[PDB]
Amino acid sequence: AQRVTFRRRNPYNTRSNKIKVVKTPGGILRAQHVKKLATRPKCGDCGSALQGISTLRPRQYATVSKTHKTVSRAYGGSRCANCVKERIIRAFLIEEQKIVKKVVKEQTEAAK
Amino acid sequence: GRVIRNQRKGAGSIFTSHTRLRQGAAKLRTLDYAERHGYIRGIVKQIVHDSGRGAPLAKVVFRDPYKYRLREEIFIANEGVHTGQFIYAGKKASLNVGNVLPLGSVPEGTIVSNVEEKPGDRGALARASGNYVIIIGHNPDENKTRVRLPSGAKKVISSDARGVIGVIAGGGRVDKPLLKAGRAFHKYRLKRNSWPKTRGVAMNPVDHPHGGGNHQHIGKASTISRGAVSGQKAGLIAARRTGLLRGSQKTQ
Amino acid sequence: AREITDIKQFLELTRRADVKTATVKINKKLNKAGKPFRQTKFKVRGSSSLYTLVINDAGKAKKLIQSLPPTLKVNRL
Amino acid sequence: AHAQSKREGRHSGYGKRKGTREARLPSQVVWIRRLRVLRRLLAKYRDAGKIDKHLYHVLYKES
Amino acid sequence: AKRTKKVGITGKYGVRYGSSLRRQVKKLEIQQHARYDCSFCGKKTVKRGAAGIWTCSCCKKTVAGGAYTVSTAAAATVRSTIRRLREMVEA
RNA sequence: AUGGUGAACUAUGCCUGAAUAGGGUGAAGCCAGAGGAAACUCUGGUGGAGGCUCGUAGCGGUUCUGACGUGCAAAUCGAUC
RNA sequence: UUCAAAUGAGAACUUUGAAGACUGAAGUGGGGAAAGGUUCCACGUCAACAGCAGUUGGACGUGGGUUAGUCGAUCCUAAGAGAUGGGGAAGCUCCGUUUCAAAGGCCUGAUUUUAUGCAGGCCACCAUCGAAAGGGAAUCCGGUUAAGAUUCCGGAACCUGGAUAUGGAUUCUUCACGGUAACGUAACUGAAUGUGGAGACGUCGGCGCGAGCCCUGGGAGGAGUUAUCUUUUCUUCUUAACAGCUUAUCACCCCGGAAUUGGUUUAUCCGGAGAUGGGGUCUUAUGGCUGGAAGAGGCCAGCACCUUUGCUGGCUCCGGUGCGCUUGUGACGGCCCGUGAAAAUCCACAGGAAGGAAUAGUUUUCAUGCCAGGUCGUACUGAUAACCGCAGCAGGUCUCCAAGGUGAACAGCCUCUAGUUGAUAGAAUAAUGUAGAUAAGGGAAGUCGGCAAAAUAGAUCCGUAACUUCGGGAUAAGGAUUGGCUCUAAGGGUCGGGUACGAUCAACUUAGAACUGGUACGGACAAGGGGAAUCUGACUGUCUAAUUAAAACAUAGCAUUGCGAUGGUCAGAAAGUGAUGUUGACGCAAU
Ligand SMILES: [Mg+2]
Ligand SMILES: [Mg+2]
Ligand SMILES: [Mg+2]
Ligand SMILES: [Mg+2]
Ligand SMILES: [Mg+2]
Ligand SMILES: [Mg+2]
Ligand SMILES: [Mg+2]
Ligand SMILES: [Mg+2]
Ligand SMILES: [Mg+2]
Ligand SMILES: [Mg+2]
Ligand SMILES: [Mg+2]
Ligand SMILES: [Mg+2]
Ligand SMILES: [Mg+2]
Ligand SMILES: [Mg+2]
Ligand SMILES: [Mg+2]
Ligand SMILES: [Mg+2]
Ligand SMILES: [Mg+2]
Ligand SMILES: [Mg+2]
Ligand SMILES: [Mg+2]
Ligand SMILES: [Mg+2]
Ligand SMILES: [Mg+2]
Ligand SMILES: [Mg+2]
Ligand SMILES: [Mg+2]
Ligand SMILES: [Mg+2]
Ligand SMILES: [Mg+2]
Ligand SMILES: [Mg+2]
Ligand SMILES: [Mg+2]
Ligand SMILES: [Mg+2]
Ligand SMILES: [Mg+2]
Ligand SMILES: [Mg+2]
Ligand SMILES: [Mg+2]
Ligand SMILES: [Mg+2]
Ligand SMILES: [Mg+2]
Ligand SMILES: [Mg+2]
Ligand SMILES: [Mg+2]
Ligand SMILES: [Mg+2]
Ligand SMILES: [Mg+2]
Ligand SMILES: [Mg+2]
Ligand SMILES: [Mg+2]
Ligand SMILES: [Mg+2]
Ligand SMILES: [Mg+2]
Ligand SMILES: [Mg+2]
Ligand SMILES: [Mg+2]
Ligand SMILES: [Mg+2]
Ligand SMILES: [Mg+2]
Ligand SMILES: [Mg+2]
Ligand SMILES: [Mg+2]
Ligand SMILES: [Mg+2]
Ligand SMILES: [Mg+2]
Ligand SMILES: [Mg+2]
Ligand SMILES: [Mg+2]
Ligand SMILES: [Mg+2]
Ligand SMILES: [Mg+2]
Ligand SMILES: [Mg+2]
Ligand SMILES: [Mg+2]
Ligand SMILES: [Mg+2]
Ligand SMILES: [Mg+2]
Ligand SMILES: [Mg+2]
Ligand SMILES: [Mg+2]
Ligand SMILES: [Mg+2]
Ligand SMILES: [Mg+2]
Ligand SMILES: [Mg+2]
Ligand SMILES: [Mg+2]
Ligand SMILES: [Mg+2]
Ligand SMILES: [Mg+2]
Ligand SMILES: [Mg+2]
Ligand SMILES: [Mg+2]
Ligand SMILES: [Mg+2]
Ligand SMILES: [Mg+2]
Ligand SMILES: [Mg+2]
Ligand SMILES: [Mg+2]
Ligand SMILES: [Mg+2]
Ligand SMILES: [Mg+2]
Ligand SMILES: [Mg+2]
Ligand SMILES: [Mg+2]
Ligand SMILES: [Mg+2]
Ligand SMILES: [Mg+2]
Ligand SMILES: [Mg+2]
Ligand SMILES: [Mg+2]
Ligand SMILES: [Mg+2]
Ligand SMILES: [Mg+2]
Ligand SMILES: [Mg+2]
Ligand SMILES: [Mg+2]
Ligand SMILES: [Mg+2]
Ligand SMILES: [Mg+2]
Ligand SMILES: [Mg+2]
Ligand SMILES: [Mg+2]
Ligand SMILES: [Mg+2]
Ligand SMILES: [Mg+2]
Ligand SMILES: [Mg+2]
Ligand SMILES: [Mg+2]
Ligand SMILES: [Mg+2]
Ligand SMILES: [Mg+2]
Ligand SMILES: [Mg+2]
Ligand SMILES: [Mg+2]
Ligand SMILES: [Mg+2]
Ligand SMILES: [Mg+2]
Ligand SMILES: [Mg+2]
Ligand SMILES: [Zn+2]
């Protein structure tokens, strides 16, 4: 039976005006307003929520120690490990085949 | 009598186009040093729906020859291009679906899209879902090249004028019936305010050359002269023939 | 806002510069399944948080209270 | 009182019914109960060793 | 248990719009909802979403294609033809 | 005729928000089964499609050519829809 | 609507008590947005006003009242609006908004005349206004007023800015270690520049979990009923922000190498691009335990006395259940010629300019500590009397919260909490009315016309034609059945079983069978008339506000026309002007 009013002056059901019913020490029901939910940061390469990283609404990230904003490998909070596995491999292999192209096409210039 | 519908469209009040959601203008790369002496690589990073367009756009990003940074162009995706694909743009680029080359650099019968009318105008011909142009010959001295646009019109342009190899994606979009009023409704909801359409013949005379009469009827020939005047030109403007097109069309 | 269990740490709080006042609460409480026992919560009002240390052992409790700084303004009950 | 006579089976004849058999209790609900239960019998039975994975796997898809 | 004799997915439209339009829709509908083979990873996990956009469930490559089918007859001949034309230019 | 004031009503577009008891129907996809020399045909489930449907709130305003017709009201009230 | 008291010259109408009803949580309840502007509250008080009255009032007189670092504004951008170099215009002014412009400010270095000149390099982003429902730094519980309260009081937090020391951490291997890994943590330098993320996004379906509500067992209290019956009926048993630890579907890692293919959702997806299995990593929605915090609040009892008003004791405990209800959120799935904003702002990473220790340095993204947080709104109404309709007008006017039974149900009907009981009154019951019902026998003979009215109706079962675009037509049509009470049978969960069964706890569905009554039983409420044809528009949709809803308009579908940009169609007095156009013939424009 105990019903309940908004607390701020805005009477409409907007995404910024979500409510939660709550039972106080007075033994009554009271509304509480509810901040929009935070979403998980995402990998810059592949796009999944990157693990190991806290999830807060954006400005709340400046009230939190830097460990909540990284893991400890190269490109910590930025890209997602598997994505960095790929980055390393390809980097290596390509820099390698650069050496291959150089010496192959070099020999062209000596027998043609 | 009153100003008729087709003259009102021109003040663009409720007739400007609904635009809030669009991706950006589709455009070739600026015709710079790279693209006109050699070629430059990019990667499509996304191919994506554009509100009220029929054909998907491809976001393709490139390095900046003159600054450390990325620069992202917005292309119209040619059928078959894909995320992760490499895109080559330049005079000395190779003939593959997705690359952008000057119509001078490609053999006759080449099939390209989003082609420029003048070099550098960053693409103007064949952009719509399915369309393309075909090179039907070159003429080296005074470097012009000749194409056939989707309309059937043959036209010649600079051989320096760029275009992108292949056809535009999303084809066939128009073989499927709209089926109900609602799907045209949503269709125009994301273009402009041009739907539905009252027949002038259902209006009163104040409203339209066709309006009024005790039965609905056009009352005079509906083929209007070129030299007609605003408020006059409704119906078949400048029509050189009329009636059901019996017999094969196709430009001779 | 803080609870505390290291009875050593606790003491060091109460001798911090910012700590002017304190308070000792006593509750009746019952043990395990059967009988009761005298719970005592030691609260130190720090500048930005209220530290409270619970001593279930009423024994530990007494000879704790006589450790309390002779200068701290303790609130009894 | 009444609730008792209900779960004693009373007051439930055709003359007391007003919503369709569906609305009173959804067909789907009936099914999902049943299907989940067969599904869950199979799991333990497999896990106990009472039945081998191959048999289970057929019973699964028969279920 | 065969549910419908011939309308198939087109049964949502009931009696409306007239058989022949429903016929024509049913075709492209079937075309457009279907699951396709992925050129790159090999699994048949390409589904549509907005016309001419075809994406892979796992492996996640997106290709531009026809409004209602991955590859379009024209696109394909055009692929064949560029192929041929390219061949001349280094041969 | 000349010069001015209106889109607080309403018409239409655009931007940003919010709203819609409970039922009936049972579309694709999927699973198991049956028949048949074959081609192929059937059955029971599962699922939950639609400018679908019964019907509130909503929005509308069909008939009574009902009330009222110096009104509650310069357009309302009731039933029915 | 009624009785009585109180008050007052005066009481159908004020106040209080009693009784009778009502609204029935889709409210006549509890709040707000627009709009009003003091109507709020108190004291006084009736000349006018409240179409009877008046001692009452939203009236009249005199006063009191609206407290913020956290609630809004303020900041940001949206459609759009609009200055500026310019270009038109006789001119009022019109066009353009980054446009044909020499369009500007930051980090510190340089100073030890001295205060800010120049020495590097960047950055070229080019006004501004535009949301009290969009984006967005941060506050809660208890108490308190005649009238304010997330604003005051108490207590306990948190954000931003500014100051900064103390402790810790780090360093002789200078800029931390640990883990095979996913990743861990109390910390663990980082300029220009670049990049990535968050902000940030449709809709509907079922399935999973949360919260509050609903139902309910034991116990401890108070209340009601008790001729008789009821271990009964009703009611209290509560826990905020914030903080520590813990907590998760998803995802990811290591071991491993799969056909007899396995795993698996209600919904058929997944695996040699590494499944099933076993082990681990992660997000902290959400929940749990503790701190906040029992000292609060709730419920009682026992003393006290004109008094402020106390004072003293207790108890405030342990459980259960689910296709419940509302809302929240997840992993999925359907749909699209529809694919469902922006900017401010915050963080991260790549980079390595630079700076920095052993006789002692570097560190404020770890803890603790210090100072500060302006300006305006804040009362009340939000409507059958505080707004708009000349008015206290049966009209109109955006929204949130939402109990019990019956029942499919937010329906109707009855009830709890709250709130009303307002609306001139008395006596009679003629005609004629308005609104609500009934009628023998006949049954549309009435009438332009079955207008009005009557009939039908739920659910379960059975049965169902022409014709068809095979989807329908269809609840076609036509039928039986239905209460009460007493039984029967089927449908589940959870545990231990060497490497067949046992035991217990908790649910209304469905079908069968007895008995039973003035043959009644969807018992009120609720709730389709059906059929055969002609005309006509395919359909859903649209309009003449206030005499026309239709066959009129629209629509998909069909067909015709114009146009490749130096363009088609259209705007403008003109123009370095404008719509289509973030466009390009699968397009735009016109029939
Ligand atoms: Mg409020
Ligand atoms: Mg971390
Ligand atoms: Mg963490
Ligand atoms: Mg525009
Ligand atoms: Mg329109
Ligand atoms: Mg028309
Ligand atoms: Mg037309
Ligand atoms: Mg007309
Ligand atoms: Mg005319
Ligand atoms: Mg004419
Ligand atoms: Mg005419
Ligand atoms: Mg005609
Ligand atoms: Mg079903
Ligand atoms: Mg279920
Ligand atoms: Mg189970
Ligand atoms: Mg299977
Ligand atoms: Mg308006
Ligand atoms: Mg919503
Ligand atoms: Mg519904
Ligand atoms: Mg029904
Ligand atoms: Mg429905
Ligand atoms: Mg066989
Ligand atoms: Mg449905
Ligand atoms: Mg409908
Ligand atoms: Mg309907
Ligand atoms: Mg109904
Ligand atoms: Mg209505
Ligand atoms: Mg309507
Ligand atoms: Mg009418
Ligand atoms: Mg009416
Ligand atoms: Mg009348
Ligand atoms: Mg009269
Ligand atoms: Mg109705
Ligand atoms: Mg009275
Ligand atoms: Mg009632
Ligand atoms: Mg109701
Ligand atoms: Mg009232
Ligand atoms: Mg109020
Ligand atoms: Mg007012
Ligand atoms: Mg008052
Ligand atoms: Mg008087
Ligand atoms: Mg008055
Ligand atoms: Mg009077
Ligand atoms: Mg008087
Ligand atoms: Mg006054
Ligand atoms: Mg005053
Ligand atoms: Mg705020
Ligand atoms: Mg300000
Ligand atoms: Mg201007
Ligand atoms: Mg502003
Ligand atoms: Mg705002
Ligand atoms: Mg806002
Ligand atoms: Mg309070
Ligand atoms: Mg006060
Ligand atoms: Mg108040
Ligand atoms: Mg305070
Ligand atoms: Mg304090
Ligand atoms: Mg600070
Ligand atoms: Mg360490
Ligand atoms: Mg950025
Ligand atoms: Mg982003
Ligand atoms: Mg938004
Ligand atoms: Mg209760
Ligand atoms: Mg909070
Ligand atoms: Mg595991
Ligand atoms: Mg391990
Ligand atoms: Mg809701
Ligand atoms: Mg999407
Ligand atoms: Mg981040
Ligand atoms: Mg240097
Ligand atoms: Mg700090
Ligand atoms: Mg200032
Ligand atoms: Mg208020
Ligand atoms: Mg009022
Ligand atoms: Mg006036
Ligand atoms: Mg009124
Ligand atoms: Mg009230
Ligand atoms: Mg009256
Ligand atoms: Mg009378
Ligand atoms: Mg009769
Ligand atoms: Mg008869
Ligand atoms: Mg007759
Ligand atoms: Mg007859
Ligand atoms: Mg007659
Ligand atoms: Mg007639
Ligand atoms: Mg006649
Ligand atoms: Mg009738
Ligand atoms: Mg009768
Ligand atoms: Mg029929
Ligand atoms: Mg019976
Ligand atoms: Mg049983
Ligand atoms: Mg019609
Ligand atoms: Mg209609
Ligand atoms: Mg009319
Ligand atoms: Mg008129
Ligand atoms: Mg109508
Ligand atoms: Mg036709
Ligand atoms: Mg000029
Ligand atoms: Zn793939």
E39/E37 Cα distance (integer angstroms)? 6
Contact E64 B107 (CB under 8 A): no
Cβ atoms A31, A13 nearer than 8 A: no
Report the candidate in E36, E27, E33 with the shortest Cα–Cα distance to residue E7. Answer: E27
Cβ neighbors of D10 (< 8 A, separation 6 or more) are: none
Experimental method: X-ray
Alpha carbon A108 to chain centroid, angstroms: 49
Cβ atoms B17, B193 nearer than 8 A: no
Residue A86: burial class (beta carbons within 10 Å; 0-12, 13-18, 19+): middle
Q: Where are the alpha helices (DSSP H) in B66-214?
A: 181-189
The Cα-based distances of B12 to B16, B21, B53, B195, B230 in angstroms read 5, 19, 20, 15, 16
Distance, CA of B85 to C1' of G285, in Å: 39
Q: Which nucleotides of F are covered by protein (CB under 7 A)?
A: 12-19, 22-29, 31-33, 41-52
B207/B4 Cα distance (integer angstroms)? 5
D49/A51 Cα distance (integer angstroms)? 38
Cβ neighbors of B152 (< 8 A, separation 6 or more) are: B250, B251
Cβ atoms A35, A61 nearer than 8 A: no
Q: Where are the alpha helices (DSSP H) in chain C?
A: 7-13, 58-65
B77/E64 Cα distance (integer angstroms)? 6
The string of DSSP letters for B27-94 reads -PPP--HHHHHS-EEEEEEEEE--TT-SS-EEEEEEEETTEEEEEEEEEEPBTT-BTT-EEEESTT--
Cβ atoms B45, B83 nearer than 8 A: yes
Ligand 45 center from residue B166 Cα (angstroms): 85
Q: Is the peptide bond before B196 cis (omega within 30 degrees of 0)?
A: yes
- E63 chain-B contacts, CB cut-off 8 A: 47, 80-83
Do D and C touch, counting CB pairs below 8 Å (3 needed)?
no
Report the candidate in B163, B20, B150, B154 with the shortest Cα–Cα distance to residue B90. Answer: B163
Cα end-to-end distance, chain E, whole Å:
59
Residue B182 tokens, joined: 């609602």
Judged by DSSP in three states, B184 sits in helix
Element of type H or E holding C31:
none
Number of other residues whose CB lies within 10 A of the CB of residue E45: 16
B92/B83 Cα distance (integer angstroms)? 23
Minimum distance, in Å, between the CA of residue E25 and any CA atom of chain B: 6
